[PDB]
Enzyme design. Structure first.
Site, PDB file in Angstrom:
ATOM      1  N   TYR A  88       0.846  -1.189   0.000  1.00  0.00           N
ATOM      2  CA  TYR A  88       0.000   0.000   0.000  1.00  0.00           C
ATOM      3  C   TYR A  88       0.885   1.244   0.000  1.00  0.00           C
ATOM      4  CZ  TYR A  88      -4.572   2.356   0.652  1.00  0.00           C
ATOM      5  OH  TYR A  88      -5.742   3.076   0.480  1.00  0.00           O
ATOM      6  N   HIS A  95      -4.178  -0.553  -2.470  1.00  0.00           N
ATOM      7  CA  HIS A  95      -5.391   0.269  -2.470  1.00  0.00           C
ATOM      8  C   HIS A  95      -6.576  -0.357  -3.223  1.00  0.00           C
ATOM      9  CE1 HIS A  95      -3.199   1.263  -6.117  1.00  0.00           C
ATOM     10  NE2 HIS A  95      -4.313   1.758  -6.635  1.00  0.00           N
ATOM     11  N   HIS A 132     -13.242  -4.029   1.555  1.00  0.00           N
ATOM     12  CA  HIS A 132     -13.567  -4.316   2.944  1.00  0.00           C
ATOM     13  C   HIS A 132     -14.403  -5.584   3.109  1.00  0.00           C
ATOM     14  CE1 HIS A 132     -15.162  -3.843   7.019  1.00  0.00           C
ATOM     15  NE2 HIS A 132     -16.319  -4.180   6.479  1.00  0.00           N
ATOM     16  N   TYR A 179      -3.847  -5.166   7.191  1.00  0.00           N
ATOM     17  CA  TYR A 179      -2.766  -4.219   6.888  1.00  0.00           C
ATOM     18  C   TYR A 179      -1.674  -4.348   7.930  1.00  0.00           C
ATOM     19  CZ  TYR A 179      -6.275  -1.852   3.946  1.00  0.00           C
ATOM     20  OH  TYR A 179      -7.254  -1.569   3.023  1.00  0.00           O
ATOM     21  N   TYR A 188     -11.754  -2.614   7.249  1.00  0.00           N
ATOM     22  CA  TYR A 188     -11.453  -1.172   7.281  1.00  0.00           C
ATOM     23  C   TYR A 188     -11.657  -0.584   8.684  1.00  0.00           C
ATOM     24  CZ  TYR A 188     -11.434  -0.909   2.023  1.00  0.00           C
ATOM     25  OH  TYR A 188     -11.170  -1.054   0.674  1.00  0.00           O
TER      26      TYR A 188
HETATM   27  O1  LIG Z   1      -9.367   1.532   6.898  1.00  0.00           O
HETATM   28  C1  LIG Z   1      -9.232   2.521   6.182  1.00  0.00           C
HETATM   29  C2  LIG Z   1      -9.381   3.929   6.779  1.00  0.00           C
HETATM   30  C3  LIG Z   1     -10.743   4.539   6.386  1.00  0.00           C
HETATM   31  C4  LIG Z   1     -10.865   5.902   6.715  1.00  0.00           C
HETATM   32  C5  LIG Z   1     -10.471   6.886   5.804  1.00  0.00           C
HETATM   33  C6  LIG Z   1     -10.605   8.231   6.140  1.00  0.00           C
HETATM   34  C7  LIG Z   1     -11.137   8.599   7.392  1.00  0.00           C
HETATM   35  C8  LIG Z   1     -11.541   7.627   8.315  1.00  0.00           C
HETATM   36  C9  LIG Z   1     -12.097   7.998   9.582  1.00  0.00           C
HETATM   37  F1  LIG Z   1     -12.894   8.935   9.422  1.00  0.00           F
HETATM   38  F2  LIG Z   1     -11.178   8.366  10.401  1.00  0.00           F
HETATM   39  F3  LIG Z   1     -12.818   6.972  10.169  1.00  0.00           F
HETATM   40  C10 LIG Z   1     -11.399   6.283   7.959  1.00  0.00           C
HETATM   41  N1  LIG Z   1      -9.243   3.811   8.249  1.00  0.00           N
HETATM   42  S1  LIG Z   1      -7.805   4.359   8.798  1.00  0.00           S
HETATM   43  O2  LIG Z   1      -7.589   3.757  10.187  1.00  0.00           O
HETATM   44  O3  LIG Z   1      -6.649   3.920   7.883  1.00  0.00           O
HETATM   45  C11 LIG Z   1      -7.771   6.126   8.943  1.00  0.00           C
HETATM   46  C12 LIG Z   1      -7.572   6.899   7.806  1.00  0.00           C
HETATM   47  C13 LIG Z   1      -7.549   8.284   7.893  1.00  0.00           C
HETATM   48  F4  LIG Z   1      -7.365   8.959   6.813  1.00  0.00           F
HETATM   49  C14 LIG Z   1      -7.736   8.932   9.124  1.00  0.00           C
HETATM   50  C15 LIG Z   1      -7.928   8.156  10.282  1.00  0.00           C
HETATM   51  C16 LIG Z   1      -7.949   6.760  10.181  1.00  0.00           C
HETATM   52  C17 LIG Z   1      -8.117   8.738  11.549  1.00  0.00           C
HETATM   53  C18 LIG Z   1      -8.618  10.174  11.404  1.00  0.00           C
HETATM   54  N2  LIG Z   1      -7.713  10.926  10.511  1.00  0.00           N
HETATM   55  C19 LIG Z   1      -7.711  10.341   9.152  1.00  0.00           C
HETATM   56  N3  LIG Z   1      -8.936   2.439   4.870  1.00  0.00           N
HETATM   57  C20 LIG Z   1      -8.766   3.555   3.900  1.00  0.00           C
HETATM   58  C21 LIG Z   1      -8.126   2.946   2.678  1.00  0.00           C
HETATM   59  C22 LIG Z   1      -8.571   1.493   2.695  1.00  0.00           C
HETATM   60  C23 LIG Z   1      -8.760   1.148   4.169  1.00  0.00           C
HETATM   61  C1  LIG Z   2      -9.309   1.251  -0.877  1.00  0.00           C
HETATM   62  S1  LIG Z   2     -10.572   1.418  -2.169  1.00  0.00           S
HETATM   63  C2  LIG Z   2     -10.826  -0.318  -2.610  1.00  0.00           C
HETATM   64  C3  LIG Z   2     -10.813  -0.514  -4.134  1.00  0.00           C
HETATM   65  C4  LIG Z   2     -12.035   0.075  -4.833  1.00  0.00           C
HETATM   66  N1  LIG Z   2     -13.140  -0.875  -4.744  1.00  0.00           N
HETATM   67  C5  LIG Z   2     -11.709   0.494  -6.273  1.00  0.00           C
HETATM   68  O1  LIG Z   2     -12.366   0.074  -7.222  1.00  0.00           O
HETATM   69  O2  LIG Z   2     -10.791   1.285  -6.519  1.00  0.00           O
HETATM   70  C6  LIG Z   2     -11.968   1.756  -1.051  1.00  0.00           C
HETATM   71  C7  LIG Z   2     -13.304   2.001  -1.741  1.00  0.00           C
HETATM   72  O3  LIG Z   2     -13.794   0.787  -2.275  1.00  0.00           O
HETATM   73  C8  LIG Z   2     -15.180   0.643  -2.049  1.00  0.00           C
HETATM   74  N2  LIG Z   2     -15.423  -0.515  -1.166  1.00  0.00           N
HETATM   75  C9  LIG Z   2     -14.494  -1.194  -0.419  1.00  0.00           C
HETATM   76  N3  LIG Z   2     -15.114  -2.206   0.224  1.00  0.00           N
HETATM   77  C10 LIG Z   2     -16.436  -2.184  -0.087  1.00  0.00           C
HETATM   78  C11 LIG Z   2     -17.530  -2.972   0.286  1.00  0.00           C
HETATM   79  N4  LIG Z   2     -17.418  -4.006   1.123  1.00  0.00           N
HETATM   80  N5  LIG Z   2     -18.773  -2.677  -0.232  1.00  0.00           N
HETATM   81  C12 LIG Z   2     -18.949  -1.626  -1.106  1.00  0.00           C
HETATM   82  N6  LIG Z   2     -17.873  -0.847  -1.465  1.00  0.00           N
HETATM   83  C13 LIG Z   2     -16.634  -1.130  -0.978  1.00  0.00           C
HETATM   84  C14 LIG Z   2     -15.650   1.959  -1.467  1.00  0.00           C
HETATM   85  O4  LIG Z   2     -15.964   2.811  -2.551  1.00  0.00           O
HETATM   86  C15 LIG Z   2     -14.404   2.472  -0.793  1.00  0.00           C
HETATM   87  O5  LIG Z   2     -14.455   3.870  -0.697  1.00  0.00           O
END
Ligand SMILES: O=C([C@@H](Cc1cccc(C(F)(F)F)c1)NS(=O)(=O)c1cc(F)c2c(c1)CCNC2)N1CCCC1
Ligand SMILES: C[S@@+](CC[C@H](N)C(=O)[O-])C[C@H]1O[C@@H](n2cnc3c(N)ncnc32)[C@H](O)[C@@H]1O
EC number: 2.1.1.364
Length: 247
Positions: free
Chosen positions: A129, A177, A181, A189, A219
């Site tokens: 990532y 990326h 989820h 991760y 997530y």
């Molecule tokens: O699990 C996650 C992120 C989702 C997330 C994105 C942006 C904001 C938040 C949230 F609002 F903090 F809950 C969550 N959760 S995170 O723990 O990585 C995250 C991502 C973030 F960008 C932030 C926080 C936490 C804390 C508040 N500041 C921003 N991801 C994003 C790409 C694919 C999986």
């Molecule tokens: C880190 S990207 C994952 C890859 C994404 N699906 C793409 O096509 O680029 C995260 C985004 O994927 C979608 N996503 C991830 N998990 C999902 C789920 N279980 N159901 C619906 N949308 C999901 C949401 O739009 C989210 O904001």
């Protein structure tokens, strides 16, 4: 003699240290956690300057024997900035290339997903990532439609894959990326120290995974802006949670 330096993630640096005990020279290698795939060549103080794809063929008393792969793909330490995701956005990671691919997600209306190319066991690094480096504050302060790909790296830094890099035609150096989820994920991760991307996160399996299986991670939406119902996550997640709880 020869030194091996193993990172907690399973990757390593290997070679003869110079006159000052530094990983500097023309015959040093980064070896991925599979202990087979390698980036071999010119390093300076552990930093990859010109690493070519290689295979660790054998080890005799700590001395590795590498064979270079045919071709001209050279890799260098190329840590992202706040604006630049990669110097070479279309140059794939070779270890990742053999383990995962991007296809339509088996989850309905979830765009693309990330899929295993092969069968592997638990605790296997599958994907990296990487993204641009921004602050938590900037993510917190901007429009929520901008935060699909924002992964927390540490208390201070977030890694993002913003437009147009969320499309594989524009960016394929790393593919972490693309993992969607699930509330029953098969991956997590984890931290990773990458010779090209530097300090980033990776996708690591939790259990054995079969070829062509979709890779999924739980997530983190504990810190979503609070609403009447608690932390207000993106609505797809809210729906899926209600859906999951029914079981
Ligand atoms: O699990 C996650 C992120 C989702 C997330 C994105 C942006 C904001 C938040 C949230 F609002 F903090 F809950 C969550 N959760 S995170 O723990 O990585 C995250 C991502 C973030 F960008 C932030 C926080 C936490 C804390 C508040 N500041 C921003 N991801 C994003 C790409 C694919 C999986
Ligand atoms: C880190 S990207 C994952 C890859 C994404 N699906 C793409 O096509 O680029 C995260 C985004 O994927 C979608 N996503 C991830 N998990 C999902 C789920 N279980 N159901 C619906 N949308 C999901 C949401 O739009 C989210 O904001």
């Amino acid at each position: 003699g020869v030194c091996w330096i193993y990172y907690p993630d399973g990757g390593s640096l290997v070679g003869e240290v110079n006159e000052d005990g530094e990983m500097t020279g023309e015959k040093i290698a980064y070896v991925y956690p599979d202990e087979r795939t390698a980036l071999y060549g010119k390093f300076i103080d552990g930093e990859m300057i010109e690493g070519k794809l290689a295979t660790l063929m054998s080890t005799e008393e700590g001395r590795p024997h590498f064979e270079l792969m045919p071709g001209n793909s050279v890799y260098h330490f190329d840590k992202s900035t706040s604006s630049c995701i990669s110097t070479n956005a279309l140059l794939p990671d070779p270890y990742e290339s053999e383990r995962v691919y991007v296809a339509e997600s088996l989850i309905s209306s979830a765009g693309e997903g990330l899929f295993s190319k092969v069968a592997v066991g638990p605790n296997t690094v599958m994907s990296f990532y990487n993204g641009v480096r921004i602050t938590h504050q900037e993510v917190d302060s901007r429009d929520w439609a901008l935060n699909g790909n924002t992964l927390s790296l540490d208390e201070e830094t977030v890694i993002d894959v913003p437009e147009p890099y969320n499309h594989v035609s524009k960016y394929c150096a790393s593919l972490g990326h693309k993992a969607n989820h699930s509330f029953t994920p098969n991956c997590i991760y984890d931290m990773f120290v990458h010779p090209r991307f530097g300090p980033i996160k990776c996708i690591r399996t939790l259990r054995a995974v079969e070829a062509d299986e979709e890779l999924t991670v739980a997530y983190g939406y504990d810190h979503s802006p609070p609403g009447k119902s608690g932390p207000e996550a993106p609505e797809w997640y809210q729906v899926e949670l209600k859906a999951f709880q029914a079981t």
